Design a protein around this ligand. Structure first.
Ligand SMILES: Nc1ncnc2c1ncn2[C@@H]1O[C@H](C[C@@H](N)CC[C@H](N)C(=O)O)[C@@H](O)[C@H]1O
Length: 383
């Protein structure tokens, strides 16, 4: 992770503060952003840094270092600019309750970076600016819904997609520039070069109010317009998990005649299901799978969520028991042609659609992404 030089250079170039203003860097350690800003915008500012570990707090004489928990810190002042790279993650857990209590945007397991964002927006004076480098997950995940509403409600938000720029991959980063005055959302793309990053305005949402953020285009919109949402034709169910199966008196750890393998994502292929190979080590009489989840008795559509931001669909003609993935059951009055549907879902046009929109924000297809995939007119419809 850390914060690459070019990224830091990028964030400081979006940073702005009135001469004499207070500049703050949460979880600063040695103050990388504080130093970079000074070396770029000058010295006529009041510098402050908040760090929780005495062994990490190492700031220059011109900066006021404060040893505290940013989340629990309550200064008697507001700031003009807040720069930083907040902690990414979860988790003497009286502190956890303390966080929940103090943070309104807190939902589910959440993530500390979300808490740092809310706190930061609150220590901001009117017109104040905040610049943070965080994961892209808050763009589409349901746990960040309250946060997106919070930001939309509080001011103007600019999101700059950076992608996987940290040493450790599988963490797509995004720079968020927030100003506590106004409203709207501007989505920006960036081009990496020998010189660093170059911003490219993608699209603006003046009436943004917390809705999921996606990279839309003309093709994206046409496809979604000329088709019905998958979430309108199907009931998206989830499979039972191992404990449940390991708790069923009929489930065996070894094969046998009459015993059927509990399928997993490695059995689901693009367009077909490999009913043979066992990947769970659990076997059970097919007939009794209905006792875990009713839909297990019905041949239906299976879409993967363990294969990244990719749509992999297959029709479970035999109706075998599954340990995971998305399970789609048709709604009452919906008639459809399974073969054409599957072909459609696994198509190159569908992959591009999903990839254009959600890039690598998350390492998998979510319900929300799933339920709004467009099904073509002549496959499935309502009677
Ligand atoms: N609650 C907190 N309050 C203040 N500083 C914190 C807090 N939690 C962690 N830090 C400090 O912030 C520094 C690290 C972060 N700035 C790094 C962010 C990086 N993106 C990460 O995921 O780790 C460390 O020196 C921590 O001691």
């Amino acid at each position: 992770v850390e914060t690459p030089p070019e990224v830091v250079d990028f964030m400081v170039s979006l940073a702005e503060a009135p001469r004499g203003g207070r500049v703050l860097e949460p979880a600063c350690a040695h103050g990388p952003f504080l130093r970079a800003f000074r070396e770029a915008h000058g010295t006529g500012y009041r510098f402050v840094g908040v760090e929780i570990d005495p062994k990490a707090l190492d700031l220059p004489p011109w900066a006021e270092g404060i040893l505290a928990d940013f989340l629990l810190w309550e200064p008697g002042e507001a700031f003009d600019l807040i720069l930083g790279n907040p902690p990414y993650g979860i988790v003497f857990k009286a502190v956890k309750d303390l966080y929940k209590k103090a943070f309104s945007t807190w939902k589910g397991k959440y993530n500390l970076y979300g808490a740092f964002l809310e706190k930061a927006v609150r220590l901001l004076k009117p017109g104040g600016v905040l610049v943070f480098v965080v994961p892209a997950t808050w763009l589409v995940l349901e746990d960040f819904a309250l946060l997106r509403e919070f930001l939309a409600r509080e001011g103007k938000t600019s999101v700059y997609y950076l992608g996987e720029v940290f040493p450790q991959k599988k963490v797509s980063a995004v720079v968020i520039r927030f100003q506590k005055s106004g409203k709207g959302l501007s989505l920006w793309d960036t081009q990496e070069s020998e010189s660093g990053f170059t911003p490219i305005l993608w699209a603006e949402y003046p009436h943004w109010e917390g809705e999921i953020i996606r990279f839309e285009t003309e093709e994206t919109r046409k496809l979604e317009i000329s088709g019905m949402p998958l979430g309108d034709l199907f009931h998206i169910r989830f499979a039972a998990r191992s404990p449940e199966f390991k708790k069923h008196p009929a489930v065996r750890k070894e094969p046998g005649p009459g015993l059927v393998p509990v399928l997993t994502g490695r059995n689901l292929k693009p367009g077909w299901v490999d009913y043979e190979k066992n990947h769970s080590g659990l076997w059970m009489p097919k007939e009794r799978a209905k006792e875990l989840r009713d839909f297990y008795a019905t041949p239906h559509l299976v879409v993967a969520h363990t294969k990244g931001t990719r749509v992999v669909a297959a029709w479970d003609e035999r109706a075998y028991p599954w340990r995971e993935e998305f399970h789609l059951l048709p709604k009452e009055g919906v008639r459809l042609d399974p073969s054409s549907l599957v072909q459609w879902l696994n198509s190159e046009a569908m992959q591009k659609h999903v990839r254009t929109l959600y890039r690598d924000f998350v390492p998998h297809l979510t319900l929300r992404m799933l339920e709004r995939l467009p099904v073509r007119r002549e496959y499935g419809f309502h009677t």
